[PDB]
Amino acid sequence: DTVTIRTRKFMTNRLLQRKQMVIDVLHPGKATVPKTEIREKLAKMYKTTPDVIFVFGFRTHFGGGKTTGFGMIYDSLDYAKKNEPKHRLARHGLYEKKKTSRKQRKERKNRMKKVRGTAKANVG
Amino acid sequence: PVARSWVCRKTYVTPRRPFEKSRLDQELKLIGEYGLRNKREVWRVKFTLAKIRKAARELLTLDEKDPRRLFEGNALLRRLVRIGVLDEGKMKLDYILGLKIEDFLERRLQTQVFKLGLAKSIHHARVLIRQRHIRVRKQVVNIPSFIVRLDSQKHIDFSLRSPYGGGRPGRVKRKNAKKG
Amino acid sequence: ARGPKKHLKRVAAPKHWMLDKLTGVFAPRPSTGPHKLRECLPLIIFLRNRLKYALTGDEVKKICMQRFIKIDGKVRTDITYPAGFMDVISIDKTGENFRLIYDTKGRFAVHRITPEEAKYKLCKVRKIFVGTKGIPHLVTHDARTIRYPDPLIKVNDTIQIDLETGKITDFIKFDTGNLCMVTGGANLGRIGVITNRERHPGSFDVVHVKDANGNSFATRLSNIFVIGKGNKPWISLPRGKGIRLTIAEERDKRLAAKQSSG
RNA sequence: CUCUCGGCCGAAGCGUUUACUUUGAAAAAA
RNA sequence: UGGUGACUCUAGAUAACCUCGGGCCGAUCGCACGCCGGCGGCGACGACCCAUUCGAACGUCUGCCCUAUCAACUUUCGAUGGUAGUCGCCGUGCCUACCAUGGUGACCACGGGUGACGGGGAAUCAGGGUUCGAUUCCGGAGAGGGAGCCUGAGAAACGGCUACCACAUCCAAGGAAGGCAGCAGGCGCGCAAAUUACCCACUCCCGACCCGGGGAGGUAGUGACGAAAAAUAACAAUACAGGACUCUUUCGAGGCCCUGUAAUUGGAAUGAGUCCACUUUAAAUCCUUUAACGAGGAUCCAUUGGAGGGCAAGUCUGGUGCCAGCAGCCGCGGUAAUUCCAGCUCCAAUAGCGUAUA
RNA sequence: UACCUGGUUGAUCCUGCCAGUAGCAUAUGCUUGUCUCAAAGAUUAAGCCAUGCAUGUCUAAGUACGCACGGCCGGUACAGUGAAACUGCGAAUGGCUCAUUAAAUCAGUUAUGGUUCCUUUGGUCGCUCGUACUUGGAUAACUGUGGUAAUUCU
Ligand SMILES: [Mg+2]
């Protein structure tokens, strides 16, 4: 119960339907606390559900009892899905990337240049 | 084209004569008195003082009411007072030329933690600082060349998480306790 | 080069944009528009870098394509749009209005205005000519072509434009005793009263301007923007009120502030 | 340094012409 | 009418013209649906022209290294100028016809050389100065060497085409296809220089585009180019080579302060490593933060050059004997070598220190 | 930090060079524990290149008769998503290198009253006194027949 959360530089982004802030977490004798653990303490701090809380960029200071990061709280999960980066949604389990490679797609692209017409589709 | 910066400096200058007997004795005395590691640590402070004396000599050739003299003279004097090298009642541009290397070497954290009684010698202070036992204002510092600002002299203490403060004993006492 | 350029390097960007060295190799190249490339503030560097409503350049696009930002009454979805001197930026979602006015250090200021003040702007006069069938035509510093103006308005004057209709409501001539701001050179951002104008035919004129504290300077006639008639400006002014402080005065004024804190 | 004009001052002519000196504005960022 | 320092400017009037290889004057598309069969509101895409933005292109004044064993050069084949025209987006010997005989030069023309792209800048530095700038910013030039074009607002474009010259690829011998001074990579050349890696998450650019693409760019790999910080030990008790310092004249007491063989004792402290986890990140790695393990002495072992002088530090001991070798320079070496080859000891800088060259 | 030292003589004082001394850039030798930043096929060969990649692009809004789709409704011209193809735009930016180049390039300063300009922004777009409630012919994608050892051929 020795981990404490404070926020600063708070501002409400009505243009992106969210609140944004800088988070300082104090944890004098522990390791850097998990982002899932931080997300729950902000849900109680701001009286909302942790489904719309996204935190990132946490750095621990030398010696170590304080970590600084950034935080966003969205009005709704729909607005979060609209405005959030698609890599920060996958961390919460809400986005799946395609399991290919730049080389794979590029080589496939250059093979279809040689083919003309609908026969482009039937090219591997 | 890259988003990189290539600005860097060298922080010392070597002496012109490599085997000057008078300079070899003078520099080893400073090394031994302040517990320094190598001669390069004397040439660094000496370089910093040489650049301070050179700015003062250039300001002293301006008019006494030159706008740049009163702006960058006050700044230099205030900077020298802040770290504790120059006195509060000697803020004149001619008293910079009376400064010495020993004044700058006395404000190191290694010298200060010893002079405050935390360490039993100037070589115990070095290892105490490097082993993460000392803090300045809730921040742990392990750089022996950390120049102590004047209004930081009172906030040099043992670290909160060290065997010499309120922390747990190190690995050796823990291991010997279970030996029996 | 075989044609026009489309990129801008970060060290080659205008210094008053205040861009750091290590964020990227490139800077936003302003789109072609009413204001010059080196005398404008693109919308991305205003929404992201100044107001911090956005953290990345992709978020500026998400604000813009929702049609939230109006530049002088029209929605612009271009994120490198060249806004410039005397423009009015309106964000209706948060109810904010801003005017692009230089501060004493030569940089565009975050100058918030009232909804009433956002209904007009002041425009310098660049060109006057007569077009087909004898119709007088103006061209301003905002690239606005306004026909059938008053015959008393001449080049180097200032007019007031109602942004809803785009018509002239009033004007101020150029003469000694009138307030002005410097919009270029080494006195950029300074406000003072015109005292003299020395004419050099075949070359550039020179205008002498005196501050409220008694400091006098000179500029080229192309760098003078008449603000108000006499001592009274026609627009709201930024915090510094156009007076350039010396470095010693600025140091004393800064040191006095931290002593007040306690 | 001065003849005409706009309400005791300015707008306009140069004093042979320069070199020199001081000032001003104009001079990319790094 | 209006304006410039100055128009052969803008605006106006009149008589005509107006290219078929042709000049503008909307047969285009979406969303909401309505008011009295008519009227309509928001946009999108196109349009001769004017202005504006991004420029580009031509000109003005001053400024560049060495060379006279380059002193006269240009003009037949445009060299300087005039007149009229062609061509060109336009101003001009840009080109043509007819005229005139001009133009530059010791205040260095003309010619030659340059391990010559030019600046912003870099090294050194009492003051003056000397040298460097292929290199990430600005301008120029090129895409094996010349030349010529099509499209287009823009190219004499080369990740466009057409020839020739030099190389070189597949072939059924009829034919077809070429351009890494882009990112990796290979050969060659050399004293001399890294991965055929991951990604569009950042900075930006392009497109019909809030969605697609980007070897631009970012991230890791190699990396003692170079720059910054900083370990390889600290303390206590003993007993001396002992040392100063207080008293005893002296023997001596020293618990007051100091250094060292300490192959003397002693536990206290810590990374470097191994390694849960979190954090970082597009996904990772690293740094930072944290559990567990992790230090006594041939170890968790610091190196590179030297010891006659310049120049800090041994005429120590053993071997060689004008030989082998050292030596930037003076010099050393011919049987007792302060200089070679080694042991010991000593000293200079130190995670760095020698050598060659500019 | 505005600095010198050794070497010509039996010995001396000079001229004068040689050598020593410190930084800085390339290469190289030996050595190398921690951590931050960070140059890197320029020099000679602007020499030659296997292979892969580096330039593409759709909104409500130019053209949809591909059942390619789960699914409406069944006289509905076209419900929607949408491959292909026609059309438009871009590919003249960026990246690389330093061969050429000696009033040439380039830098500061000026002029276009001597030119052009895609696009952005604003103006203009019943100003002309002379089938329209919609005009004509094709050609891609697709179907089908093919040629060549061979191509992003046709
Ligand atoms: Mg000696």
PDB file of all heavy atoms in Angstrom, chain E residues 84-94:
ATOM      1  P     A E  84      16.236  49.208 -86.430  1.00  0.00           P
ATOM      2  OP1   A E  84      15.168  50.136 -85.993  1.00  0.00           O
ATOM      3  OP2   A E  84      17.037  48.489 -85.412  1.00  0.00           O
ATOM      4  O5'   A E  84      15.610  48.100 -87.388  1.00  0.00           O
ATOM      5  C5'   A E  84      15.002  48.445 -88.621  1.00  0.00           C
ATOM      6  C4'   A E  84      14.950  47.265 -89.562  1.00  0.00           C
ATOM      7  O4'   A E  84      16.295  46.904 -89.978  1.00  0.00           O
ATOM      8  C3'   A E  84      14.394  45.970 -88.994  1.00  0.00           C
ATOM      9  O3'   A E  84      12.980  45.931 -88.926  1.00  0.00           O
ATOM     10  C2'   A E  84      14.989  44.929 -89.927  1.00  0.00           C
ATOM     11  O2'   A E  84      14.300  44.929 -91.167  1.00  0.00           O
ATOM     12  C1'   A E  84      16.382  45.505 -90.158  1.00  0.00           C
ATOM     13  N9    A E  84      17.371  44.961 -89.204  1.00  0.00           N
ATOM     14  C8    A E  84      17.845  45.562 -88.069  1.00  0.00           C
ATOM     15  N7    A E  84      18.715  44.845 -87.409  1.00  0.00           N
ATOM     16  C5    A E  84      18.832  43.685 -88.156  1.00  0.00           C
ATOM     17  C6    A E  84      19.602  42.524 -87.980  1.00  0.00           C
ATOM     18  N6    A E  84      20.438  42.338 -86.963  1.00  0.00           N
ATOM     19  N1    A E  84      19.495  41.548 -88.900  1.00  0.00           N
ATOM     20  C2    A E  84      18.654  41.736 -89.922  1.00  0.00           C
ATOM     21  N3    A E  84      17.877  42.782 -90.193  1.00  0.00           N
ATOM     22  C4    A E  84      18.011  43.739 -89.263  1.00  0.00           C
ATOM     23  P     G E  85      12.262  45.181 -87.699  1.00  0.00           P
ATOM     24  OP1   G E  85      10.804  45.416 -87.795  1.00  0.00           O
ATOM     25  OP2   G E  85      12.970  45.575 -86.460  1.00  0.00           O
ATOM     26  O5'   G E  85      12.554  43.632 -87.952  1.00  0.00           O
ATOM     27  C5'   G E  85      11.706  42.845 -88.777  1.00  0.00           C
ATOM     28  C4'   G E  85      12.460  41.721 -89.443  1.00  0.00           C
ATOM     29  O4'   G E  85      13.875  42.026 -89.454  1.00  0.00           O
ATOM     30  C3'   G E  85      12.380  40.359 -88.773  1.00  0.00           C
ATOM     31  O3'   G E  85      11.202  39.651 -89.116  1.00  0.00           O
ATOM     32  C2'   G E  85      13.654  39.671 -89.253  1.00  0.00           C
ATOM     33  O2'   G E  85      13.483  39.157 -90.564  1.00  0.00           O
ATOM     34  C1'   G E  85      14.629  40.843 -89.327  1.00  0.00           C
ATOM     35  N9    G E  85      15.487  40.959 -88.133  1.00  0.00           N
ATOM     36  C8    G E  85      15.532  42.025 -87.273  1.00  0.00           C
ATOM     37  N7    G E  85      16.395  41.870 -86.313  1.00  0.00           N
ATOM     38  C5    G E  85      16.961  40.627 -86.558  1.00  0.00           C
ATOM     39  C6    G E  85      17.962  39.922 -85.848  1.00  0.00           C
ATOM     40  O6    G E  85      18.572  40.260 -84.831  1.00  0.00           O
ATOM     41  N1    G E  85      18.241  38.701 -86.434  1.00  0.00           N
ATOM     42  C2    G E  85      17.641  38.215 -87.562  1.00  0.00           C
ATOM     43  N2    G E  85      18.038  37.011 -87.986  1.00  0.00           N
ATOM     44  N3    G E  85      16.707  38.860 -88.235  1.00  0.00           N
ATOM     45  C4    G E  85      16.418  40.053 -87.683  1.00  0.00           C
ATOM     46  P     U E  86      10.530  38.631 -88.075  1.00  0.00           P
ATOM     47  OP1   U E  86       9.235  38.197 -88.640  1.00  0.00           O
ATOM     48  OP2   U E  86      10.569  39.262 -86.738  1.00  0.00           O
ATOM     49  O5'   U E  86      11.494  37.363 -88.086  1.00  0.00           O
ATOM     50  C5'   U E  86      11.565  36.514 -89.222  1.00  0.00           C
ATOM     51  C4'   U E  86      12.523  35.365 -89.016  1.00  0.00           C
ATOM     52  O4'   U E  86      13.864  35.867 -88.801  1.00  0.00           O
ATOM     53  C3'   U E  86      12.260  34.478 -87.810  1.00  0.00           C
ATOM     54  O3'   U E  86      11.261  33.503 -88.064  1.00  0.00           O
ATOM     55  C2'   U E  86      13.630  33.873 -87.529  1.00  0.00           C
ATOM     56  O2'   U E  86      13.882  32.776 -88.389  1.00  0.00           O
ATOM     57  C1'   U E  86      14.566  35.013 -87.924  1.00  0.00           C
ATOM     58  N1    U E  86      15.040  35.806 -86.767  1.00  0.00           N
ATOM     59  C2    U E  86      16.016  35.276 -85.940  1.00  0.00           C
ATOM     60  O2    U E  86      16.501  34.170 -86.093  1.00  0.00           O
ATOM     61  N3    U E  86      16.399  36.093 -84.910  1.00  0.00           N
ATOM     62  C4    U E  86      15.924  37.354 -84.638  1.00  0.00           C
ATOM     63  O4    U E  86      16.361  37.976 -83.674  1.00  0.00           O
ATOM     64  C5    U E  86      14.929  37.828 -85.540  1.00  0.00           C
ATOM     65  C6    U E  86      14.534  37.060 -86.551  1.00  0.00           C
ATOM     66  P     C E  87      10.177  33.124 -86.941  1.00  0.00           P
ATOM     67  OP1   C E  87       9.211  32.175 -87.536  1.00  0.00           O
ATOM     68  OP2   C E  87       9.682  34.382 -86.338  1.00  0.00           O
ATOM     69  O5'   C E  87      11.020  32.356 -85.829  1.00  0.00           O
ATOM     70  C5'   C E  87      11.719  31.158 -86.125  1.00  0.00           C
ATOM     71  C4'   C E  87      12.750  30.850 -85.070  1.00  0.00           C
ATOM     72  O4'   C E  87      13.807  31.843 -85.104  1.00  0.00           O
ATOM     73  C3'   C E  87      12.270  30.906 -83.632  1.00  0.00           C
ATOM     74  O3'   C E  87      11.522  29.777 -83.228  1.00  0.00           O
ATOM     75  C2'   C E  87      13.571  31.093 -82.870  1.00  0.00           C
ATOM     76  O2'   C E  87      14.307  29.881 -82.831  1.00  0.00           O
ATOM     77  C1'   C E  87      14.303  32.056 -83.795  1.00  0.00           C
ATOM     78  N1    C E  87      14.080  33.468 -83.407  1.00  0.00           N
ATOM     79  C2    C E  87      14.814  33.982 -82.342  1.00  0.00           C
ATOM     80  O2    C E  87      15.620  33.251 -81.761  1.00  0.00           O
ATOM     81  N3    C E  87      14.647  35.263 -81.960  1.00  0.00           N
ATOM     82  C4    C E  87      13.771  36.029 -82.599  1.00  0.00           C
ATOM     83  N4    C E  87      13.636  37.291 -82.188  1.00  0.00           N
ATOM     84  C5    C E  87      13.004  35.537 -83.690  1.00  0.00           C
ATOM     85  C6    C E  87      13.186  34.265 -84.056  1.00  0.00           C
ATOM     86  P     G E  88      10.230  29.989 -82.309  1.00  0.00           P
ATOM     87  OP1   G E  88       9.442  28.741 -82.325  1.00  0.00           O
ATOM     88  OP2   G E  88       9.600  31.264 -82.708  1.00  0.00           O
ATOM     89  O5'   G E  88      10.823  30.204 -80.854  1.00  0.00           O
ATOM     90  C5'   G E  88      11.797  29.324 -80.321  1.00  0.00           C
ATOM     91  C4'   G E  88      12.470  29.942 -79.125  1.00  0.00           C
ATOM     92  O4'   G E  88      13.271  31.076 -79.547  1.00  0.00           O
ATOM     93  C3'   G E  88      11.539  30.522 -78.075  1.00  0.00           C
ATOM     94  O3'   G E  88      11.015  29.541 -77.198  1.00  0.00           O
ATOM     95  C2'   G E  88      12.423  31.548 -77.384  1.00  0.00           C
ATOM     96  O2'   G E  88      13.310  30.912 -76.477  1.00  0.00           O
ATOM     97  C1'   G E  88      13.234  32.085 -78.565  1.00  0.00           C
ATOM     98  N9    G E  88      12.592  33.275 -79.143  1.00  0.00           N
ATOM     99  C8    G E  88      11.736  33.310 -80.209  1.00  0.00           C
ATOM    100  N7    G E  88      11.302  34.505 -80.477  1.00  0.00           N
ATOM    101  C5    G E  88      11.904  35.306 -79.522  1.00  0.00           C
ATOM    102  C6    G E  88      11.814  36.701 -79.311  1.00  0.00           C
ATOM    103  O6    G E  88      11.167  37.535 -79.947  1.00  0.00           O
ATOM    104  N1    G E  88      12.588  37.103 -78.234  1.00  0.00           N
ATOM    105  C2    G E  88      13.352  36.277 -77.460  1.00  0.00           C
ATOM    106  N2    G E  88      14.030  36.859 -76.465  1.00  0.00           N
ATOM    107  N3    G E  88      13.448  34.976 -77.646  1.00  0.00           N
ATOM    108  C4    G E  88      12.702  34.562 -78.688  1.00  0.00           C
ATOM    109  P     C E  89       9.429  29.341 -77.055  1.00  0.00           P
ATOM    110  OP1   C E  89       9.193  27.944 -76.631  1.00  0.00           O
ATOM    111  OP2   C E  89       8.795  29.835 -78.298  1.00  0.00           O
ATOM    112  O5'   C E  89       9.022  30.296 -75.847  1.00  0.00           O
ATOM    113  C5'   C E  89       7.697  30.786 -75.705  1.00  0.00           C
ATOM    114  C4'   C E  89       7.640  31.911 -74.703  1.00  0.00           C
ATOM    115  O4'   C E  89       8.060  31.419 -73.409  1.00  0.00           O
ATOM    116  C3'   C E  89       8.563  33.087 -74.976  1.00  0.00           C
ATOM    117  O3'   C E  89       7.999  34.021 -75.878  1.00  0.00           O
ATOM    118  C2'   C E  89       8.815  33.664 -73.589  1.00  0.00           C
ATOM    119  O2'   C E  89       7.743  34.505 -73.194  1.00  0.00           O
ATOM    120  C1'   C E  89       8.782  32.413 -72.719  1.00  0.00           C
ATOM    121  N1    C E  89      10.119  31.872 -72.380  1.00  0.00           N
ATOM    122  C2    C E  89      10.837  32.427 -71.327  1.00  0.00           C
ATOM    123  O2    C E  89      10.364  33.394 -70.725  1.00  0.00           O
ATOM    124  N3    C E  89      12.039  31.910 -70.996  1.00  0.00           N
ATOM    125  C4    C E  89      12.521  30.867 -71.664  1.00  0.00           C
ATOM    126  N4    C E  89      13.710  30.384 -71.305  1.00  0.00           N
ATOM    127  C5    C E  89      11.805  30.269 -72.734  1.00  0.00           C
ATOM    128  C6    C E  89      10.619  30.793 -73.048  1.00  0.00           C
ATOM    129  P     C E  90       8.907  34.696 -77.011  1.00  0.00           P
ATOM    130  OP1   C E  90       8.019  35.326 -78.013  1.00  0.00           O
ATOM    131  OP2   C E  90       9.884  33.678 -77.446  1.00  0.00           O
ATOM    132  O5'   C E  90       9.707  35.836 -76.244  1.00  0.00           O
ATOM    133  C5'   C E  90       9.131  37.113 -76.017  1.00  0.00           C
ATOM    134  C4'   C E  90       9.879  37.880 -74.954  1.00  0.00           C
ATOM    135  O4'   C E  90      10.047  37.033 -73.783  1.00  0.00           O
ATOM    136  C3'   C E  90      11.304  38.289 -75.290  1.00  0.00           C
ATOM    137  O3'   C E  90      11.442  39.344 -76.245  1.00  0.00           O
ATOM    138  C2'   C E  90      11.908  38.493 -73.906  1.00  0.00           C
ATOM    139  O2'   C E  90      11.414  39.669 -73.286  1.00  0.00           O
ATOM    140  C1'   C E  90      11.293  37.308 -73.166  1.00  0.00           C
ATOM    141  N1    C E  90      12.159  36.109 -73.254  1.00  0.00           N
ATOM    142  C2    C E  90      13.194  35.979 -72.332  1.00  0.00           C
ATOM    143  O2    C E  90      13.335  36.852 -71.470  1.00  0.00           O
ATOM    144  N3    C E  90      14.013  34.912 -72.386  1.00  0.00           N
ATOM    145  C4    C E  90      13.836  33.991 -73.325  1.00  0.00           C
ATOM    146  N4    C E  90      14.670  32.951 -73.344  1.00  0.00           N
ATOM    147  C5    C E  90      12.797  34.092 -74.289  1.00  0.00           C
ATOM    148  C6    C E  90      11.994  35.157 -74.216  1.00  0.00           C
ATOM    149  P     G E  91      11.463  40.906 -75.864  1.00  0.00           P
ATOM    150  OP1   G E  91      10.400  41.178 -74.870  1.00  0.00           O
ATOM    151  OP2   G E  91      11.474  41.648 -77.144  1.00  0.00           O
ATOM    152  O5'   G E  91      12.876  41.151 -75.173  1.00  0.00           O
ATOM    153  C5'   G E  91      13.096  42.314 -74.385  1.00  0.00           C
ATOM    154  C4'   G E  91      14.535  42.454 -73.950  1.00  0.00           C
ATOM    155  O4'   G E  91      14.876  41.433 -72.988  1.00  0.00           O
ATOM    156  C3'   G E  91      15.590  42.313 -75.030  1.00  0.00           C
ATOM    157  O3'   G E  91      15.735  43.511 -75.773  1.00  0.00           O
ATOM    158  C2'   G E  91      16.839  41.934 -74.238  1.00  0.00           C
ATOM    159  O2'   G E  91      17.471  43.091 -73.715  1.00  0.00           O
ATOM    160  C1'   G E  91      16.253  41.142 -73.068  1.00  0.00           C
ATOM    161  N9    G E  91      16.431  39.683 -73.174  1.00  0.00           N
ATOM    162  C8    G E  91      15.495  38.769 -73.581  1.00  0.00           C
ATOM    163  N7    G E  91      15.932  37.542 -73.543  1.00  0.00           N
ATOM    164  C5    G E  91      17.227  37.647 -73.064  1.00  0.00           C
ATOM    165  C6    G E  91      18.193  36.644 -72.809  1.00  0.00           C
ATOM    166  O6    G E  91      18.094  35.423 -72.960  1.00  0.00           O
ATOM    167  N1    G E  91      19.378  37.185 -72.333  1.00  0.00           N
ATOM    168  C2    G E  91      19.604  38.518 -72.130  1.00  0.00           C
ATOM    169  N2    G E  91      20.816  38.839 -71.667  1.00  0.00           N
ATOM    170  N3    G E  91      18.711  39.464 -72.364  1.00  0.00           N
ATOM    171  C4    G E  91      17.550  38.961 -72.824  1.00  0.00           C
ATOM    172  P     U E  92      16.570  43.547 -77.140  1.00  0.00           P
ATOM    173  OP1   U E  92      16.419  44.896 -77.724  1.00  0.00           O
ATOM    174  OP2   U E  92      16.204  42.363 -77.948  1.00  0.00           O
ATOM    175  O5'   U E  92      18.081  43.406 -76.667  1.00  0.00           O
ATOM    176  C5'   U E  92      19.110  43.157 -77.606  1.00  0.00           C
ATOM    177  C4'   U E  92      20.245  42.375 -77.001  1.00  0.00           C
ATOM    178  O4'   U E  92      19.754  41.500 -75.953  1.00  0.00           O
ATOM    179  C3'   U E  92      20.953  41.438 -77.956  1.00  0.00           C
ATOM    180  O3'   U E  92      21.878  42.100 -78.796  1.00  0.00           O
ATOM    181  C2'   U E  92      21.575  40.419 -77.015  1.00  0.00           C
ATOM    182  O2'   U E  92      22.727  40.953 -76.386  1.00  0.00           O
ATOM    183  C1'   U E  92      20.475  40.284 -75.966  1.00  0.00           C
ATOM    184  N1    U E  92      19.537  39.187 -76.298  1.00  0.00           N
ATOM    185  C2    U E  92      19.970  37.876 -76.178  1.00  0.00           C
ATOM    186  O2    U E  92      21.084  37.558 -75.805  1.00  0.00           O
ATOM    187  N3    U E  92      19.042  36.930 -76.513  1.00  0.00           N
ATOM    188  C4    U E  92      17.753  37.151 -76.944  1.00  0.00           C
ATOM    189  O4    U E  92      17.034  36.188 -77.206  1.00  0.00           O
ATOM    190  C5    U E  92      17.379  38.525 -77.045  1.00  0.00           C
ATOM    191  C6    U E  92      18.262  39.469 -76.725  1.00  0.00           C
ATOM    192  P     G E  93      21.656  42.108 -80.384  1.00  0.00           P
ATOM    193  OP1   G E  93      22.163  43.399 -80.902  1.00  0.00           O
ATOM    194  OP2   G E  93      20.260  41.710 -80.672  1.00  0.00           O
ATOM    195  O5'   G E  93      22.606  40.939 -80.894  1.00  0.00           O
ATOM    196  C5'   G E  93      23.876  40.729 -80.293  1.00  0.00           C
ATOM    197  C4'   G E  93      24.327  39.300 -80.427  1.00  0.00           C
ATOM    198  O4'   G E  93      24.259  38.907 -81.825  1.00  0.00           O
ATOM    199  C3'   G E  93      25.763  39.035 -79.986  1.00  0.00           C
ATOM    200  O3'   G E  93      25.864  37.695 -79.506  1.00  0.00           O
ATOM    201  C2'   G E  93      26.525  39.142 -81.301  1.00  0.00           C
ATOM    202  O2'   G E  93      27.777  38.489 -81.304  1.00  0.00           O
ATOM    203  C1'   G E  93      25.538  38.483 -82.255  1.00  0.00           C
ATOM    204  N9    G E  93      25.688  38.814 -83.676  1.00  0.00           N
ATOM    205  C8    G E  93      25.831  37.879 -84.669  1.00  0.00           C
ATOM    206  N7    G E  93      25.922  38.391 -85.857  1.00  0.00           N
ATOM    207  C5    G E  93      25.829  39.755 -85.646  1.00  0.00           C
ATOM    208  C6    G E  93      25.868  40.817 -86.582  1.00  0.00           C
ATOM    209  O6    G E  93      25.995  40.747 -87.808  1.00  0.00           O
ATOM    210  N1    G E  93      25.741  42.053 -85.963  1.00  0.00           N
ATOM    211  C2    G E  93      25.593  42.239 -84.615  1.00  0.00           C
ATOM    212  N2    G E  93      25.483  43.512 -84.211  1.00  0.00           N
ATOM    213  N3    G E  93      25.555  41.257 -83.730  1.00  0.00           N
ATOM    214  C4    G E  93      25.679  40.042 -84.306  1.00  0.00           C
ATOM    215  P     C E  94      25.177  37.238 -78.126  1.00  0.00           P
ATOM    216  OP1   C E  94      24.538  38.392 -77.456  1.00  0.00           O
ATOM    217  OP2   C E  94      26.198  36.464 -77.385  1.00  0.00           O
ATOM    218  O5'   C E  94      24.052  36.206 -78.580  1.00  0.00           O
ATOM    219  C5'   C E  94      24.058  34.872 -78.094  1.00  0.00           C
ATOM    220  C4'   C E  94      23.142  33.970 -78.883  1.00  0.00           C
ATOM    221  O4'   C E  94      21.768  34.385 -78.715  1.00  0.00           O
ATOM    222  C3'   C E  94      23.336  33.947 -80.388  1.00  0.00           C
ATOM    223  O3'   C E  94      24.411  33.116 -80.784  1.00  0.00           O
ATOM    224  C2'   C E  94      21.984  33.454 -80.888  1.00  0.00           C
ATOM    225  O2'   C E  94      21.888  32.045 -80.757  1.00  0.00           O
ATOM    226  C1'   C E  94      21.030  34.084 -79.878  1.00  0.00           C
ATOM    227  N1    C E  94      20.369  35.320 -80.354  1.00  0.00           N
ATOM    228  C2    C E  94      19.449  35.298 -81.409  1.00  0.00           C
ATOM    229  O2    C E  94      19.200  34.241 -82.003  1.00  0.00           O
ATOM    230  N3    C E  94      18.857  36.455 -81.780  1.00  0.00           N
ATOM    231  C4    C E  94      19.128  37.588 -81.136  1.00  0.00           C
ATOM    232  N4    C E  94      18.517  38.701 -81.533  1.00  0.00           N
ATOM    233  C5    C E  94      20.044  37.635 -80.052  1.00  0.00           C
ATOM    234  C6    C E  94      20.628  36.488 -79.698  1.00  0.00           C
TER     235        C E  94
END
